[PDB]
Structures are given as structure tokens and as C-alpha cells.
Design a protein around this ligand. Structure first.
Ligand SMILES: [Zn+2]
Ligand SMILES: [Zn+2]
Length: 104
């Protein structure tokens, strides 16, 4: 939801990808300000219909723009996640729903 105050410890639940529920890894923040982990971005966005999976904002030009500049990852957010949940980030780097409405 809102800005994390300076030096505040973020809750785990803010640091989880809202698509896959894993800790956010290499978070990608779309220009509508929704964020998802890079693996989810590749699956649910880059390789699907290039819309934000949260608000359906079109993100095809945004994706070309940043893929070309290798700047997909929100680096400041990624910094903060690894600072506060480093073990979670390591574990990930090691590898009932009535409403199924998000494609692959
Ligand atoms: Zn994810
Ligand atoms: Zn969005």
C-alpha cells in the first residue's frame, strides 16, 4: 500500500509477491506501481499478455523500454528486501482457491 518510512522494517507480507506468495525476488514494479517477482513477471506478463496482472494496465512499451535498458528490476526495493529478509531471499535463490482468474 504506502511508502515504507525511512529505516522501517517492512512486514514479511509486504515483501511477498502477490502472485505466487514467495518472497519477492528481483522485484519488478510496473508503472502503475504494482510489483511482482521477476519470475512471475516473466510468466504472467512478459510471456502472456503484457498487462499488469493487478490492474490490467498495458505494459508492452514499458517492457520493451526497460528490457532494452536492462532496468526491469526495481533496484531500491530489491535492496530493501535483501536487507530485511536476506535468508528468505537465499532460500528462494535455492528453489483452496474458488477464484482462478489469473492466466498461467
Ligand atoms: Zn511471484
Ligand atoms: Zn497495475
Amino acid at each position: 500500500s504506502m511508502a515504507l518510512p525511512k529505516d522501517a522494517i517492512p512486514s514479511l507480507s509486504e515483501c511477498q509477491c502477490g502472485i505466487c506468495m514467495e518472497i519477492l525476488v528481483e522485484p519488478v514494479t510496473l508503472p502503475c506501481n504494482h510489483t511482482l517477482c521477476k519470475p512471475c513477471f516473466q510468466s504472467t506478463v512478459e510471456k502472456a499478455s503484457l498487462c499488469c496482472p493487478f490492474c490490467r494496465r498495458r505494459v508492452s512499451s514499458w517492457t520493451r523500454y526497460h528490457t532494452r535498458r536492462n532496468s526491469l528490476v526495481n533496484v531500491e526495493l530489491w535492496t530493501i528486501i535483501q536487507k530485511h529478509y536476506p535468508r528468505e531471499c537465499k532460500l528462494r535463490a535455492s528453489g483452496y482457491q474458488p477464484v482462478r482468474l489469473l492466466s498461467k
